[PDB]
Design a protein around this ligand. Structure first.
Ligand SMILES: CCS(=O)(=O)N(Cc1ccc(C(=O)NO)cc1)Cc1cccnc1
Ligand SMILES: [K+]
Ligand SMILES: [Zn+2]
Length: 357
């Protein structure tokens, strides 16, 4: 089996010109890449090139107005970019932001194509800016275009429209954009684990609660696993995978798995407040590799401790390459609020997934 890897240093050009210490740093991707080389993982992978997404590809998920506005930012002066970014929730923009967002998406299209033709078995995409908060018609939370959602639609476009795509979103934040894009879709199963705190954690919406199961033909195809009242870690994530993610995923029987792989639930993150370990992420990756005949694409989302994200994402690639999972620590009993969350999701989704009964 061959593992693909995409990284292009041009995606570093998107930057915050007023606050050079803003956490969504250019060096997030160069640090992950460096750790892959330092652990000798890079040379074991097959390099996949980045490319620009086209505007037609962006239109698979985004409105023409939103595409045009972000495109127009390429020609603006700093004062105007500061004002434009401030129109969104948690966005900074530089003159390279649009192109970097296009490269992030195109990188993932090339990776999905390589997976779907068998050029590689699985792949990792070391990309920024992230995607999962981006909506059809707007940017949000450091995200301009929804890379994972676009990759699902691109995959369908080169195979068949009903190709079953599973998106597992383990970034500590709810992927509101991904949920909304696919909310009425039964061809793309969206499963998110996220810190929720009864709607008080970013992005601050009850859309992230366990009772949002999808709409229309998509009822049952949106699975929110929301965490409340606890510093969750490996025990809680392993339990969620055993009781919810894996049984639902196996019943769905995806033909492609995309991971919205934020590393902001990691131990050490300055924002997530959680303690998932690098070995925990390795175990989650290894479990997902049992789906879709191994056709897994891991897409970087958030994650802001450079050391944490570099170790964590490298351990995921080690798993894609076929290495044996590192040993987890002794798993403490689940925090009681985590058991409540799991039970709530189980009861909300048992009507749709007989494997949960
Ligand atoms: C000073 C504002 S903020 O930086 O703290 N922030 C903006 C932000 C947006 C998206 C991501 C991310 O990773 N999405 O996947 C992270 C941060 C809000 C925030 C605060 C606490 C916990 N989370 C988020
Ligand atoms: K869906
Ligand atoms: Zn996040």
């Amino acid at each position: 089996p061959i593992t693909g890897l995409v990284y292009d240093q041009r995606m570093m050009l998107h930057h915050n010109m007023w606050d050079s210490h803003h956490p969504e740093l250019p060096q997030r991707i160069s640090r992950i890449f460096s750790r892959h080389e330092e652990l000798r993982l890079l040379s074991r992978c097959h390099r996949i090139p980045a490319r620009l997404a086209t505007e037609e590809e962006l239109a698979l998920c985004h409105s023409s107005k939103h595409i045009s506005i972000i495109k127009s930012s390429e020609h603006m002066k700093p004062r105007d970019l500061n004002r434009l970014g401030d129109e969104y929730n948690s966005i900074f923009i530089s003159n390279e932001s649009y192109t970097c967002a296009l490269l992030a998406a195109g990188s993932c299209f090339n990776s999905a194509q390589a997976i779907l033709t068998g050029q590689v078995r699985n792949a990792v995409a070391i990309v920024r800016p992230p995607g999962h908060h981006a909506e059809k018609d707007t940017a949000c939370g450091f995200c301009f275009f929804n890379t994972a959602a676009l990759t699902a639609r691109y995959a369908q476009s080169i195979t068949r429209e009903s190709l079953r795509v599973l998106i597992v979103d383990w970034d500590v934040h709810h992927g509101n954009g991904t949920q909304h894009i696919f909310e009425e879709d039964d061809s793309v199963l969206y499963i998110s684990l996220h810190r929720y705190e009864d709607g008080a954690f970013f992005p601050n919406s009850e859309d992230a609660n366990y009772d949002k199961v999808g709409l229309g033909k998509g009822r049952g195809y949106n699975v929110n696993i929301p965490w409340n009242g606890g510093k969750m870690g490996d025990p809680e994530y392993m339990a969620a995978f055993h009781h919810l993610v894996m049984p639902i995923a196996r019943e769905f029987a995806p033909e492609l798995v995309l991971v919205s792989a934020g590393f902001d639930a990691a131990r050490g993150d300055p924002l997530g407040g959680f303690q998932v370990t690098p070995e925990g992420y390795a175990h989650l990756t290894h479990q997902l590799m049992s789906l879709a005949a191994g056709r897994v694409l891991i897409i970087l989302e958030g994650g802001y401790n450079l050391t944490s994200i570099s170790e964590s994402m490298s351990m995921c690639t080690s798993m894609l390459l076929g290495d044996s999972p590192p040993s987890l620590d002794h798993l403490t009993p689940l925090k009681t609020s985590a058991t409540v969350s799991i039970n709530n999701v189980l009861r909300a989704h048992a009507p749709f997934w007989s494997s949960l009964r």
